[PDB]
Amino acid sequence: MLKIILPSLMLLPLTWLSSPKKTWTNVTSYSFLISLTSLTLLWQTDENYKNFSNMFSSDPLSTPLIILTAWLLPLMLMASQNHLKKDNNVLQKLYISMLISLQILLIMTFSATELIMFYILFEATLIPTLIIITRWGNQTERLNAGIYFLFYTLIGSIPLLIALILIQNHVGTLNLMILSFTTHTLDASWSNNLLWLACMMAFLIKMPLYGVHLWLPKAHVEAPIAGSMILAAILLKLGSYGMIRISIILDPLTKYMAYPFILLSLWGMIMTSSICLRQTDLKSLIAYSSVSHMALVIASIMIQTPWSFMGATMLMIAHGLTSSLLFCLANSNYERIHSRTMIMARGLQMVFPLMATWWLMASLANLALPPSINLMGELFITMSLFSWSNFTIILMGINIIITGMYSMYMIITTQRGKLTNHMINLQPSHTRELTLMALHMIPLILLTTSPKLITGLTM
Amino acid sequence: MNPITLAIIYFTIFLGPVITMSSTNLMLMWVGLEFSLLAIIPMLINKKNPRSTEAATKYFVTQATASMIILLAIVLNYKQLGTWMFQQQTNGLILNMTLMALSMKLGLAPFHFWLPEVTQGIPLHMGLILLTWQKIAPLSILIQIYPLLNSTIILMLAITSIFMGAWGGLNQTQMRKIMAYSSIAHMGWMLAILPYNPSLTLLNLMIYIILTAPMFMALMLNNSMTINSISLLWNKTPAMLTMISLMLLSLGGLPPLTGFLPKWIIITELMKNNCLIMATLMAMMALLNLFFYTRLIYSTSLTMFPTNNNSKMMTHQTKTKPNLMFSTLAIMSTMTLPLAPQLI
Amino acid sequence: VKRFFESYHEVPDGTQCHRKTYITTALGGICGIIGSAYSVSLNPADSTLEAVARVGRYTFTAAAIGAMFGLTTCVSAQVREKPDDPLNYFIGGCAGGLTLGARTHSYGTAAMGCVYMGTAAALFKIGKLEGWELFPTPKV
Amino acid sequence: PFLDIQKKLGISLDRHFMFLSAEQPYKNAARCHAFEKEWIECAHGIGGTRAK
Amino acid sequence: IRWTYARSANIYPNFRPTPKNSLLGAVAGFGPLIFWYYVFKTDRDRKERLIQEGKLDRKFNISY
Amino acid sequence: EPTMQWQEDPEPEDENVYAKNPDFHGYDSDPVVDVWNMRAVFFFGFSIVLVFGTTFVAYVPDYRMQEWARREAERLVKYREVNGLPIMESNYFDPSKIQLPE
Amino acid sequence: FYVREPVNAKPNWLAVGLSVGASVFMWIYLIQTHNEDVLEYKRRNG
Amino acid sequence: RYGLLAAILGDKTTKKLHEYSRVITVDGNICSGKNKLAKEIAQQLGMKHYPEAGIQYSSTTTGDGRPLDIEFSGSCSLEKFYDDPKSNDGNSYRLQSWLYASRLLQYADALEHLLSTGQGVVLERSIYSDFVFLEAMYNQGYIRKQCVDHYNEIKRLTLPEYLPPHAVIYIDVPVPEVQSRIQKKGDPHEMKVTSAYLQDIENAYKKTFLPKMSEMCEVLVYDSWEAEDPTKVVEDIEYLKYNKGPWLKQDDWTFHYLRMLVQDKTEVLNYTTIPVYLPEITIGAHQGSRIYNSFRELPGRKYAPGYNAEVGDKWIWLK
Amino acid sequence: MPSTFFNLTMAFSLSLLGTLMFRSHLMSTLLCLEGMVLSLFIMTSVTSLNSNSMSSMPIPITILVFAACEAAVGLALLVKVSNTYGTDYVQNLNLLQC
Amino acid sequence: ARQWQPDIEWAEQFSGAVMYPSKETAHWKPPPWNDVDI
Amino acid sequence: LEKTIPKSTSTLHTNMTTLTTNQKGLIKLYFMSFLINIILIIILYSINL
Amino acid sequence: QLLREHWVHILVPAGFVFGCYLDRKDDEKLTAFRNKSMLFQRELRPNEEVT
Amino acid sequence: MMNGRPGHEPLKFLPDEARSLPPPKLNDPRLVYMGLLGYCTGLMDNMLRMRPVMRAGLHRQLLFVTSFVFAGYFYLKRQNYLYAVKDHDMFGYIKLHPEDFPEKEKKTYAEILEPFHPV
Amino acid sequence: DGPEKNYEKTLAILQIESEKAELRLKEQEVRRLMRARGDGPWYQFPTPEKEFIDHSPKATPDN
Numbered sequence A: 001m002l003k004i005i006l007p008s009l010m011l012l013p014l015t016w017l018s019s020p021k022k023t024w025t026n027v028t029s030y031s032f033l034i035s036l037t038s039l040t041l042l043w044q045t046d047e048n049y050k051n052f053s054n055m056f057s058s059d060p061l062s063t064p065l066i067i068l069t070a071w072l073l074p075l076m077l078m079a080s081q082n083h084l085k086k087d088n089n090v091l092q093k094l095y096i097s098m099l100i101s102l103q104i105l106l107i108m109t110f111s112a113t114e115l116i117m118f119y120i121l122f123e124a125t126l127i128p129t130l131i132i133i134t135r136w137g138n139q140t141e142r143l144n145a146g147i148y149f150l151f152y153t154l155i156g157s158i159p160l161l162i163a164l165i166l167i168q169n170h171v172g173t174l175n176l177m178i179l180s181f182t183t184h185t186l187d188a189s190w191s192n193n194l195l196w197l198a199c200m201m202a203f204l205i206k207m208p209l210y211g212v213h214l215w216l217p218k219a220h221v222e223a224p225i226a227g228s229m230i231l232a233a234i235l236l237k238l239g240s241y242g243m244i245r246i247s248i249i250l251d252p253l254t255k256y257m258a259y260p261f262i263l264l265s266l267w268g269m270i271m272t273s274s275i276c277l278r279q280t281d282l283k284s285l286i287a288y289s290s291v292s293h294m295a296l297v298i299a300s301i302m303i304q305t306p307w308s309f310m311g312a313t314m315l316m317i318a319h320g321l322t323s324s325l326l327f328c329l330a331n332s333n334y335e336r337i338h339s340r341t342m343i344m345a346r347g348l349q350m351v352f353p354l355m356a357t358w359w360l361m362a363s364l365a366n367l368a369l370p371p372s373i374n375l376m377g378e379l380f381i382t383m384s385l386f387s388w389s390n391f392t393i394i395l396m397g398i399n400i401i402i403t404g405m406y407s408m409y410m411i412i413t414t415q416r417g418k419l420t421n422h423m424i425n426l427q428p429s430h431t432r433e434l435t436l437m438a439l440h441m442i443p444l445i446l447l448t449t450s451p452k453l454i455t456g457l458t459m
Numbered sequence B: 001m002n003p004i005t006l007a008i009i010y011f012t013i014f015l016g017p018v019i020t021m022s023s024t025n026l027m028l029m030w031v032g033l034e035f036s037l038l039a040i041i042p043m044l045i046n047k048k049n050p051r052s053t054e055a056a057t058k059y060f061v062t063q064a065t066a067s068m069i070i071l072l073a074i075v076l077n078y079k080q081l082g083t084w085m086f087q088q089q090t091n092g093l094i095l096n097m098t099l100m101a102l103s104m105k106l107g108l109a110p111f112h113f114w115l116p117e118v119t120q121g122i123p124l125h126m127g128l129i130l131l132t133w134q135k136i137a138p139l140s141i142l143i144q145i146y147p148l149l150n151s152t153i154i155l156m157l158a159i160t161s162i163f164m165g166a167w168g169g170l171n172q173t174q175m176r177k178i179m180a181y182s183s184i185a186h187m188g189w190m191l192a193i194l195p196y197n198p199s200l201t202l203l204n205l206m207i208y209i210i211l212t213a214p215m216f217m218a219l220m221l222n223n224s225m226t227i228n229s230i231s232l233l234w235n236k237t238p239a240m241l242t243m244i245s246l247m248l249l250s251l252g253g254l255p256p257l258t259g260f261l262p263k264w265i266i267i268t269e270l271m272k273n274n275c276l277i278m279a280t281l282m283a284m285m286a287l288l289n290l291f292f293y294t295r296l297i298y299s300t301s302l303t304m305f306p307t308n309n310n311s312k313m314m315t316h317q318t319k320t321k322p323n324l325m326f327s328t329l330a331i332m333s334t335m336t337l338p339l340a341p342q343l344i
Numbered sequence C: 001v002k003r004f005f006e007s008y009h010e011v012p013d014g015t016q017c018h019r020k021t022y023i024t025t026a027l028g029g030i031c032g033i034i035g036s037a038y039s040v041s042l043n044p045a046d047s048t049l050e051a052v053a054r055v056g057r058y059t060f061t062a063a064a065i066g067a068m069f070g071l072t073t074c075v076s077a078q079v080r081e082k083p084d085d086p087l088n089y090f091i092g093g094c095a096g097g098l099t100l101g102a103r104t105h106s107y108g109t110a111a112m113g114c115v116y117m118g119t120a121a122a123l124f125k126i127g128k129l130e131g132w133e134l135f136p137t138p139k140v
Numbered sequence D: 001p002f003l004d005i006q007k008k009l010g011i012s013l014d015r016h017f018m019f020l021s022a023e024q025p026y027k028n029a030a031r032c033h034a035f036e037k038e039w040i041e042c043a044h045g046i047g048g049t050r051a052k
Numbered sequence E: 001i002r003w004t005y006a007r008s009a010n011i012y013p014n015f016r017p018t019p020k021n022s023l024l025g026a027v028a029g030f031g032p033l034i035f036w037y038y039v040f041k042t043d044r045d046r047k048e049r050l051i052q053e054g055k056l057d058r059k060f061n062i063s064y
Numbered sequence F: 001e002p003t004m005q006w007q008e009d010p011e012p013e014d015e016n017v018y019a020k021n022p023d024f025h026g027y028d029s030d031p032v033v034d035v036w037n038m039r040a041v042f043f044f045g046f047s048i049v050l051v052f053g054t055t056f057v058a059y060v061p062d063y064r065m066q067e068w069a070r071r072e073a074e075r076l077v078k079y080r081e082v083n084g085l086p087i088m089e090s091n092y093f094d095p096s097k098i099q100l101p102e
Numbered sequence G: 001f002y003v004r005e006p007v008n009a010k011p012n013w014l015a016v017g018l019s020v021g022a023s024v025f026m027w028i029y030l031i032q033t034h035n036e037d038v039l040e041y042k043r044r045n046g
Numbered sequence H: 001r002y003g004l005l006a007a008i009l010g011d012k013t014t015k016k017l018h019e020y021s022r023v024i025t026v027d028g029n030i031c032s033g034k035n036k037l038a039k040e041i042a043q044q045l046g047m048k049h050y051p052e053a054g055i056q057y058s059s060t061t062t063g064d065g066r067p068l069d070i071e072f073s074g075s076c077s078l079e080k081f082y083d084d085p086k087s088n089d090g091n092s093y094r095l096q097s098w099l100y101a102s103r104l105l106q107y108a109d110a111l112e113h114l115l116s117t118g119q120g121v122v123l124e125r126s127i128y129s130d131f132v133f134l135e136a137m138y139n140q141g142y143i144r145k146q147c148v149d150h151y152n153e154i155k156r157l158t159l160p161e162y163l164p165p166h167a168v169i170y171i172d173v174p175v176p177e178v179q180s181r182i183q184k185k186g187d188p189h190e191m192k193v194t195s196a197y198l199q200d201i202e203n204a205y206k207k208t209f210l211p212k213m214s215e216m217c218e219v220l221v222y223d224s225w226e227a228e229d230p231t232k233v234v235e236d237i238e239y240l241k242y243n244k245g246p247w248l249k250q251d252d253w254t255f256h257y258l259r260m261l262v263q264d265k266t267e268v269l270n271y272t273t274i275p276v277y278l279p280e281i282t283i284g285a286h287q288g289s290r291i292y293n294s295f296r297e298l299p300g301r302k303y304a305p306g307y308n309a310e311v312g313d314k315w316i317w318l319k
Numbered sequence I: 001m002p003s004t005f006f007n008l009t010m011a012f013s014l015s016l017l018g019t020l021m022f023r024s025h026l027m028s029t030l031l032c033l034e035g036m037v038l039s040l041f042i043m044t045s046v047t048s049l050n051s052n053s054m055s056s057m058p059i060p061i062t063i064l065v066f067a068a069c070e071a072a073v074g075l076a077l078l079v080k081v082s083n084t085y086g087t088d089y090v091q092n093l094n095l096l097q098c
Numbered sequence J: 001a002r003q004w005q006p007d008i009e010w011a012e013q014f015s016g017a018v019m020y021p022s023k024e025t026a027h028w029k030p031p032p033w034n035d036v037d038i
Numbered sequence K: 001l002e003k004t005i006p007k008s009t010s011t012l013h014t015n016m017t018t019l020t021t022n023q024k025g026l027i028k029l030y031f032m033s034f035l036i037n038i039i040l041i042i043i044l045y046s047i048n049l
Numbered sequence L: 001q002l003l004r005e006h007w008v009h010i011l012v013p014a015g016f017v018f019g020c021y022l023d024r025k026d027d028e029k030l031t032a033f034r035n036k037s038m039l040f041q042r043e044l045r046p047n048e049e050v051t
Numbered sequence M: 001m002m003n004g005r006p007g008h009e010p011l012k013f014l015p016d017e018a019r020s021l022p023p024p025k026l027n028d029p030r031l032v033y034m035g036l037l038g039y040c041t042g043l044m045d046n047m048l049r050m051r052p053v054m055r056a057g058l059h060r061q062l063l064f065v066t067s068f069v070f071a072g073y074f075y076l077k078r079q080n081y082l083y084a085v086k087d088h089d090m091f092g093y094i095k096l097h098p099e100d101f102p103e104k105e106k107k108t109y110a111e112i113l114e115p116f117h118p119v
Numbered sequence N: 001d002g003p004e005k006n007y008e009k010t011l012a013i014l015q016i017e018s019e020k021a022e023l024r025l026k027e028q029e030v031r032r033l034m035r036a037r038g039d040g041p042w043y044q045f046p047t048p049e050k051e052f053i054d055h056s057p058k059a060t061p062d063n
């Protein structure tokens, strides 16, 4: 694993000392080399999981996130290469360093076994994000947004830690697969119930429900492309991975400790998908769509069925990539205009003839057009939920419909009307942003082709 | 203050605690306490301005009552047994009085409403000592007598300090008073852990010191004792920020830094000893300290406030005050979490 | 002799409302006296008249809070016969916070107090049941 | 104690009269000399909770 | 710009809580969740008692 | 007397890059740097990563044994079909070595 | 070229050589002590 | 160096405070014979003369000593003030504050020179003398009471900690003669000042500066021709005494603390760069950042003095 | 012995009240401090001479000297206060609350 | 457009000796900058 | 969902801070408070033995 | 010259080398159970030195 | 805590008893990290005094690094000693009092009943 | 290399971690017993010494 980390810990001094004319290219290409080397984990010949020490490990549920992160790093770099163009070399170097620290932390956590290490990394993820969001935004409320982000996250963090302590004491160790081979069952009293809470509350507060979805839009809006990318892609996924790895112990509590959370997740999926219709701000629309899909993820995580877990992982990866892509497109249309509003720029596709086909290929992946990992996940999760009850296809379908609606609303208020006549600032497409779109897409094709990699624990 | 006087006073200040600790007699302890008190008052009152004099009066009065109370305790112990030292056979009221006095002498709450006023009246190079070389002997006294204490009131006092310090820090702008409230809270953490494992109070104290001293160095730099006077650091000297931000987040106790480790292993001990409720309160109310550190991070680094023209006349100049130990302690605070086991 | 505060758990939640209510009202008066003493020693006012008026405001307020809370929890325990379950104490704390809000003339404070105090009481009951000790003694 | 500088140097400055039955100047023994000499001898070799 | 401001951020400041508003809010936040919940709980209890009896034809439900 | 505005530079203007470097690519205003960085991106991320990564993966063997297992099932089914045993017993562990209460 | 070339205008050979010498002596004492401890440890535990 | 150590070692101040180790001002109005007079005085009394601190004292002392660009230096313009006052920009106050600060730097370096070597100094208009201009501005209406209060606060903060000047000469020339000298010199900006301006200057001087300071420093009011005859001034000052002031309420150790404070070239200005927000001087982060970047891009200011390589330093990898 | 000792402890408590409650002066507080110190010195010497212990007698001397010096610096501070305000009152110290 | 940075109306809610003067009792005056009162 | 969780916490902590820093610098009051605390501690020990 | 510029490209390869070496050292540790397991317990055929 | 154990030689950094313990191979990651800390501290001091970083104060950096290591070495020895002592005392007390630790030999999953918890 | 490598590595790791868990779950108990009954070297609180006492005649037989 050091083979993945150490070079990512060398990109930093590399950035510091390299000359301005060359740091961008050098660090970018070498981060791509890191992404490449990050595939050794896929030599999972047999079912014996990979273990490198008492301090690291890998797994089928973690490897995807690792590669996706090591591959979203350079895309953040590139998408962060036209703005802050008049900001000093030292400042842009700081930005690069923060991105790289995010990468390294995310890798170490998605790999680590001991949930306490996982937790310290899960909470160290903040500093770079808070910074990136406050020191490089474009509005004023970014401050309140960062505050909300930080404090939601830490409120979650605390009882999680307290329960990790209670465990480490009652049980002997915290190492995973030992928690498995020596788990037990609980008398199911108010004590163990509040323990279940203090263990899942943080992961949920992070992966937003209806009740606490508030810090997502502010972040994705006030913050720049890279922060938006990384939020929509991974910093949510951390909660899901933690919940998956930890729920192994709390059996059986999660049968009746789920109804409220499943209910909230579904209702929130619906209401947020509806708001996605009448939400002006494009990035806010995208954020609420992300909420709508992560609600499915959660409803599939709780009930603990194998189909459900595989669908969760599929939809997870798919949404990560697709949201990064949509945010790239938004930023693109913003740098030329400097207004997030959806109804200002209209009737494109007459001057950006190609870009549309990078807009289209995203929506179709949002509304679950097959053959896509998106629909595979949505469908397996709907199957699990139908088994768990026959009266949830209702909500699945309402969500599918409202999505099929607002995805096209977005396509049609930006690439289907008639062109304005005062947007003389429409610098044509840059090879760079076209490349970012292509790189976010192509992997969707290859994974639609061969998804056995992207299944999960149960496959 | 001529050099002979300066040297003698610094010597007595460096002595008081040394005796208070190395002595096994409570009278010698009380003596060292009085040494610190006396030898310090001047350093507070040197400027001879009204505010300094007022702060001196407050400080002296409170610490006098405290010392006399501790003396009453010792004498009652004498009448009771005969020895000048505390044993495991002393009526708990005496311990409770000793604890009230030590608290009032430290700054714990609700005996704390005199620390912010004084620390606002004082300059920096004496508030630093007031917070980092006067809270040692009073803590050594406890280190000696931790077994037979009253956990109930110790915990009530600690958590009360947590709450009140945080709630006051949410408002106070004056950085001196902010630092004072932070001291209150951290000493609350210590007293909370104390009767279970003292080494952890030692650790919390050393860490709070290593985080405070360099902040006060960065302040002594400019005599910027206000938020709108420190926000101008990015135009006076844009270098201290990459370390001030870290140190304040640390004082808050963010995991990847070191300021977290104390709270972490402390909660561990309290969970071993079944105090998880108060542990939860402490952990869920340190977040306000974290808050009003973040709110200064904002003002200084993450966003640039309006400067003042004459700062150009300043920048034309130079400055070589900031010695090496500042950076040394900053680093050995922020980037030393991997070495917690080697710290225990 | 501390019996006036220990008797609260001689019987379970159930009858003896005339006792549980006196006890909760006593706690109300105590907390009121204490908070009033602090807010009189500090943040003083003009006349002893207004000072003791503030004191009595606080004291009667807390007394009524404790009375209403303990009474609700002795009544629910009687009717909804699932005594040990803490929803009794939660509803009682909600009614108490609502009384506090009706006194202070603030619906927001009413609801805030409902939530916070009710959950606090439910946790007190959870502790009394599962032996969670407060102000412990050191045995690592 | 806390900082055993005294025991390290093998000296004594205060701890030679920390209690009652120490060496009084002109051999004038105190009131409860014997009872102290027994309490201490029972509380030696062991620590604290044993003696209490 | 002003339209966006009024739809996005000028809301809470000029917002004043009153009844029928608190009422509609509590409704939208409580009612439907609880309806769906009673539905699901009744269904699950039906299924559970059916299985405990040992009747519900589960043939071919090998993957779930 | 009425009021004054805090001295501040004016709002910069909206410009064009293609007016001075119609060979643009999006990265920098230095053409050589643009060219070399875009060639780096493409090569290191279209020629090597995508291609060699896809190749590696596609030629990975028996990912999580979904091939060895098919083989093993074929062999076991042959064995049992011949020997008359059933293809799947409703009890996994030997109920003999096991022991139960009353 | 300045007008008031201050203290930093030229090096302090005293402190330079002092630091280098103390560093070298730290290194050498470290190595000697480590080798001594290795010898003695192997001696006392085979 | 002058830490406490050199003092303990012997490099004190009283051991070189000899005769004529004094400090003087030669104040008056705009075009009196100030510079010729002060230079005559300096030559006759072996002191050193410090010219009138303007808008470039800092840039000329620090670095390679060349008049820097206005963006880095204050952003004021005396010519633009004389041409267009009352504008919506703020030149009046963002010039007066800058000039006060530079004058303060002057006085500080002067006390340093003195307390290090008793060789006395002569000063033109000083920090005590740089408030009549502001009072004239306000009385004419060029400026806001808020800015006046800001200035008075800065003064209350800095002015005290330093020691007033032993001797103070005041040259009294009225508006008509001052205007004659103006027109003789010739300048399209000086040519446009107002007799009321100069009259307010004179009034403020002769009302505040003289009584205030006759109680804690020696004064000498002279006229045009008595100045044109300098030597008389020299002999007056020589045979004059220097009672009634703080400068003898001091000793080695207060002199030492004062010298340390002065030598500290930012303990003088941590109370002049204070955060009180006025749209006159108040500058935004964008401008401040741009200017700091350009300055640190300049040669000789990128790094500290003894480290900039390009300029032609060496041994830059040991110190 | 026990009676007089309890009474001396009562006197200490009374000086405690005198110091912890003011009547718009400062010399009263300092005099109550002196009363505390006197009661303590007395109780200690009594304990010693009752136990017939001798080596423990230096302690009253020590603490009496320290109380002398303490009250001395307190009086110096009182004096600076009076000479910088105009009197030794207590309600003049409304500063530092900002 | 460009990064919005703070300004006077944002910084002059801190100049007050204490944040959050939600009460009338927060009617005090800022403290001097040299620790001297008139 | 904003008036409930975050703005409620804000108002609450804000008011508690207003209280705990509405204090004026009067020893005549600080000492009375110290005395109340001493009384409390003594009484608690007495009850709990 | 040019190495001051074109040397930086040596770090990352060196980092990868160091990483593989550290993993090799870790795997050389934990050498216990080299062949003592109960599902890959061989006879150590001649001339076939240990894993 | 343990400062009263049998014959706790007071204020002695490393007793002779701490020569029968394997010292740390100088390649140890902890010492290496302290070296990095010294280097970064020199960097920070230079950037604070406004000096060329990575090419100034070489003697300063050497001093920092070597001091940090020269300390870490012996501090780490002391800590290894403390942990060894803790473990030794624990095992000794266990060997003294076995009854306080009944060697409960668990039962097989055959004899023990794992209760069920479906889905 | 082969799967057996990772297999046996996993096995050694599990052994280590289980032994660690055992040690900690025993250390808690040991420390508890020591603190509660002082039967051990740890938590040996400080007692009055016995070397600064006199065993010489004291000018009067009694005492």
Ligand SMILES: Nc1ncnc2c1ncn2[C@@H]1O[C@H](COP(=O)(O)OP(=O)(O)OP(=O)(O)O)[C@@H](O)[C@H]1O
Residues within 6 Å of the ligand: H029, H030, H031, H032, H033, H034, H035, H036, H052, H078, H096, H099, H124, H130, H133, H190
């Ligand atoms: N505080 C001030 N504010 C604005 N302008 C000033 C200020 N002080 C001086 N000036 C301008 O600077 C110029 C100084 O020239 P001045 O006549 O004083 O020369 P001098 O030093 O008297 O020598 P001489 O007059 O013999 O040439 C004046 O024309 C005056 O307008």
